[PDB]
Amino acid sequence: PTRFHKSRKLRGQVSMGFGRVGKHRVSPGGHGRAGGQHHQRTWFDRFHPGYFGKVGMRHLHLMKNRADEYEPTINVDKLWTLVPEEVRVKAAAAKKGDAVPVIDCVQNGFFKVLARGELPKIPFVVRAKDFSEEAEKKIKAAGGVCEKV
Amino acid sequence: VAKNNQIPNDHLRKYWYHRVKTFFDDPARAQRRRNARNLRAKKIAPRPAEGPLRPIVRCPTVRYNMKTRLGRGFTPKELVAAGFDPALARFQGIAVDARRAHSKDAMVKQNVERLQAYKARLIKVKKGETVEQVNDAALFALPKAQNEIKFRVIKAEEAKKDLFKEKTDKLKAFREAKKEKAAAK
Amino acid sequence: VKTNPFVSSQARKVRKSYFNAKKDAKHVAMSAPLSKELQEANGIKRLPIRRDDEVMIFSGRMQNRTGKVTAVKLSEMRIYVDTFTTEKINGQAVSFPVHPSNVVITKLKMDKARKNLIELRRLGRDQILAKLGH
RNA sequence: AAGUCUCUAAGCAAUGGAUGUCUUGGCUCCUCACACGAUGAAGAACGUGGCAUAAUGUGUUAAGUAACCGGAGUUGCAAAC
RNA sequence: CGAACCAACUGUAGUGGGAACGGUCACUAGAUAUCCAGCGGGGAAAGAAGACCCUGUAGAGCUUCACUUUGGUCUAGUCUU
RNA sequence: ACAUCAGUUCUAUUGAACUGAGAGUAGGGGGAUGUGGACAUUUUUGUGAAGGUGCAAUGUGAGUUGGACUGGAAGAAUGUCUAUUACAGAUCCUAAUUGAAGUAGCGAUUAUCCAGGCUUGUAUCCUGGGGGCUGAUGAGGAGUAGGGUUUCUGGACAACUU
RNA sequence: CUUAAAUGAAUUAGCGUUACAAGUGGGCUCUGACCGGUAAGCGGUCAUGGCGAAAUGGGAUGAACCAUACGUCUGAAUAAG
RNA sequence: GUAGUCUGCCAUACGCAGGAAGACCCGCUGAACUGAAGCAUCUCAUUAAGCGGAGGAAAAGAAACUAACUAGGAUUCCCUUAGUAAAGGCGAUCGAAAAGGGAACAGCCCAACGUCUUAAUCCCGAGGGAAAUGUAGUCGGUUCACCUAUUGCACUGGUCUAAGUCAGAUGGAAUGCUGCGCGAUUCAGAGUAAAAGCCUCGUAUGACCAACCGCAAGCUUACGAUGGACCGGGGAGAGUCGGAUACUUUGAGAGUAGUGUCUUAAGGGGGUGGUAUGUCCCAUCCAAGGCUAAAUAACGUGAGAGACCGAUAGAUUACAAGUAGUGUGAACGAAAGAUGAAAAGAACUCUAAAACAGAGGGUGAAAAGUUCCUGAACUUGCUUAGGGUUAAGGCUAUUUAUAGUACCCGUCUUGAAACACGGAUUAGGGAGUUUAUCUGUAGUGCGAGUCUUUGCACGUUAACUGUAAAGGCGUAGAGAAAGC
């Protein structure tokens, strides 16, 4: 607060840490983003290149609850994080038979699946909307199923 | 503009400083709300204050298909199935909504069972007497959605499928359809 | 500590209400204890003072004299008394004001309202001491 | 090389209203209310009290009167009750 | 009886250097002080943030072959028909 | 010889021994003093609080402290918190006050003089008598507009009528 | 992977890297070199130094020249002179 | 000629309108300073001023609505979406909505059309009048189910409350100082000649006895009301929607909304689905009439709290202030608080022409003696002590009047003692602060998580405490985009 400021120690000093010859004044450059193509261009060119101009295709009436914009992603390395850890320990000790647990991505808010890392060799079933090529490949290789919705 | 900071984006060019709205009301506002709903529940007695009863209802868009919330009111179809009088059921403490008619068969079976649990232990005050105001947040509140696993048996018709070749060669079939009509004309 | 919100505990507000009270409250604010001869008789400690009765001050220039009340004053907030007089430099006695809370009441004169006040506070003091249990 | 002059200091004063201490006044925030008027409002003027110019009451019933509710002198002098 | 302007502190000169025209600096010449009436050499005396000149991406008055327009006038179409 | 700021050798608990350096505008960093109010903790005060005036210490310094006189009721310390928080300047603001200065000056309007009255006190207020002025568009007698009791009698001189 | 042989100029010295931010964007000048000019305490450049922000001593006096760049004191012997 | 109607004007009976206030609210009208480092579109802003009109709240409001789903379901407001989609000399800048979470939650009825009801309706108080140029009422019929009485508005004062004026010294006065008691559902606060749990008012807390105890609306047991199914039906707002064009307006982009001009539909059909245009499907609603509480707003007016100010502050105003006072006028607008516990406010005498002015003498603890507490500085008077041809002051050194030294501060400047500007003296005021969106460093807590706030539940109540679910940022990016 007001005690700890540098302004408080600069009593006596006549300019308060702002120069004699220049004189600290309200409008040096011009207001806000002004002179971006003229006299403050060096700042724009140096720090924020590509600022000026128009690119892309105009999108009218964009909504983000559509299943065109809205795809949350999850990765193959996990999935097992969605289920609690007592489940998959029982699923490890099993024959080629029955009781293969369904990891529902869509309940938890994850539509697509994306293979960035490994799995174990447990059987399981991924219910999701979509997959990648390599994510579908890795789930087969572990020994499990790729359901669509 | 100076240094490495991001472009100066402050929406403060209008005279905002005349149109200020400070919220020092908030805890006094809380009591004006709170003292109203106590002066309600005494006047409403012997009827239950947490009511009126409202339906369970699925939310619309793709990213809330999971969740289920409280609606506005039950349909005239759902009341008559449960055993109620559509017009009179407003005054029995059940909210009614004539408009909604996109609710499919699964969510009707909830809301019929919801009204039956109400109509099972609704009772009526006679003439002279007075009855104790039985509050019950368990009945009116929605049941929380959860599923644990639903583990199931493996098909052994999985390696038959490959989804990615089914996806891509539907698109590559569609691409050649347009390019034939463009080329031939 | 006070629970009632509508009474104020700021010193500005209390002084302003005190000095600019209504007439009925100011008579109650001007009051004094009885002497122990009258306490056993009437069964009350504290009473408001009138122009009938007489009063006796410990500690002062005018130490330990009885004398009747010539005038109560509610704006000036003090009591004139018989006997309590210094002369001027001119040969002229002037009565000298004293605040009643320094003073003990030695004799009292009845009024319908004064008897009706006393019979209330006697019955009140019997209830409260039975409640506290002394 | 003279001084009652001029310059400096201290003590006691004159002038002036700083400092310090006081506070029936503000400022803000929250709460409750808005039920003014042809049944003459808001605003203006002038009257009227024993000594009353301003303000406040009040309108030839003019610091008030009647009724109900409080219940004993709410201030200088004078007078009455 | 009884004001005001103005006032950094001040109030003798010469040369020297110095923001290049010193009351204060250095080196010299002078001097005892305090008053009166005159007086206009000096205090680059006082009165006005220079009305001249220039600056400003500052104005205003006026002009037109500057750039934009708005109105007025003329002409056409439609309605009243 | 002493102080400060670095560093080197060591050191638990904040230190030791020793070596080196010294300008500073614009400007930056570190530690410290003081002021209005707050929350704890601890006190002082009618055997005289704050404040104020002089004097003696003390700190490199911003400051702090003692005792004397004055005053007559509240003040201060330690640790954290907070700010309408420290002035010689702004042709600064408000309030009071100097020199210049007992100086500049007391104008314009006919002209005053002598004896009495009233008084502590008159050239001035009144009486009497000289000498004058205004010299019918007159400081004569009366009215619009405007002023609003300035009209009249009695008493009064703190101020005003150079 | 490994077969041989060494730390193979002087003098000095720890070196490397990142982040955030102030003031500044009117300069002046000694000695030499130089462009324009009759020349200027003139205008425009170059190299090291100085002033600006640097006291003290010396050149009587001086921002810039000479000696030298500074804690508070007490001595000794010097520099420019 | 008289007897109905139609149209117009006049007179009269009975209640209504106007004016005030205008912070908030509703409808119009409408700037510029400013920013863009110029300026004209743009921005400030659909803002200020102006005109018109409401209420304690107003306005909005019961789908010609969203959406594309595992579907929502009137209006209003808060959080988020989002500084995003979009707009923009694509510059400056500007900028929404659905969904999701929460507060609150309430629906109703004219028109016409039921091709029925003998106006079955309403006002006036025995009968007159309005109304057929249209008031009033449930579409008709069978048959099972079922409901039965409460709901708005209105609500009043008074009485009573614990424990030391303890003892001693000081003092004008004791509440302070030393020592011993007692109260507490009351140690909030104030008054009292001085600092008070126990001197007084109160505070606290339950007990006590009077005043009321009614206004409308609806009831009240069945062919009375309501609903489901089946049978047989009627209709649903025209210079209006819409179109072209012009202007204003918007995030709305080959038009978001409004308005002028001209033009103008359909009703087994029409609107909407954010790129103009025709065209084929699917989905979803039915415009052009009306009423409606609650959550919400509040720079006006009237009537507890504080880490705020303490008389040059705080409101212009602590006081006979919107006063004194100024201007033809619209308008403008000060200064000014404190005697003492209590007036005990200074009798009487002396000098004097004397309500001139003192001097004695008194009041009070102390003159504190009347814009009187404290009474600083500048300036002045008296007394005491020294210096003086060097304008004065400063610093260093001592035997204290000498020696040496010493240009006037602040300021722009390459350069100020300058004949550069500011500065007569003194006191008191007097200038890098705060908000939003971010940047980086350091501290702190948790950590693939984290934030608990919009709000609800608590409370010794704006705090603190507890907690459900969303949401924010992070966890995956590149591309104009499709797809990845």
TrEMBL record, chain A:
Residues 73-147 form the Large ribosomal subunit protein uL15/eL18 domain. InterPro entries: Ribosomal_uL15, Ribosomal_uL15/eL18, Ribosomal_uL15/eL18_sf, Ribosomal_uL15_CS. It comes from Trichomonas vaginalis (strain ATCC PRA-98 / G3). It comes from the Eukaryota. The keyword Ribonucleoprotein applies. GO terms for biological process: translation. Belongs to the universal ribosomal protein uL15 family. This is Large ribosomal subunit protein uL15/eL18 domain-containing protein. GO terms for molecular function: structural constituent of ribosome. GO terms for cellular component: cytosolic large ribosomal subunit. Keywords: Ribonucleoprotein, Ribosomal protein.
TrEMBL record, chain B:
Pfam families: Ribosomal_L13e. GO terms for cellular component: cytosolic large ribosomal subunit. GO terms for molecular function: RNA binding; structural constituent of ribosome. Keywords: Ribonucleoprotein, Ribosomal protein. InterPro entries: Ribosomal_eL13. GO terms for biological process: translation. It comes from the Eukaryota. Belongs to the eukaryotic ribosomal protein eL13 family. This is Ribosomal protein L13e, putative.
UniProtKB/TrEMBL annotation, chain C:
It holds the Pfam family Ribosomal_L26. One of its GO terms (cellular component) is cytosolic large ribosomal subunit. One of its GO terms (molecular function) is structural constituent of ribosome. The keyword ATP-binding does not apply. Keywords: Ribonucleoprotein, Ribosomal protein. CDD domains: KOW_RPL26. GO terms for biological process: cytoplasmic translation; ribosomal large subunit biogenesis. Belongs to the universal ribosomal protein uL24 family. This is Ribosomal protein L24, putative. The lineage of its organism: Eukaryota, Metamonada, Parabasalia, Trichomonadida, Trichomonadidae.
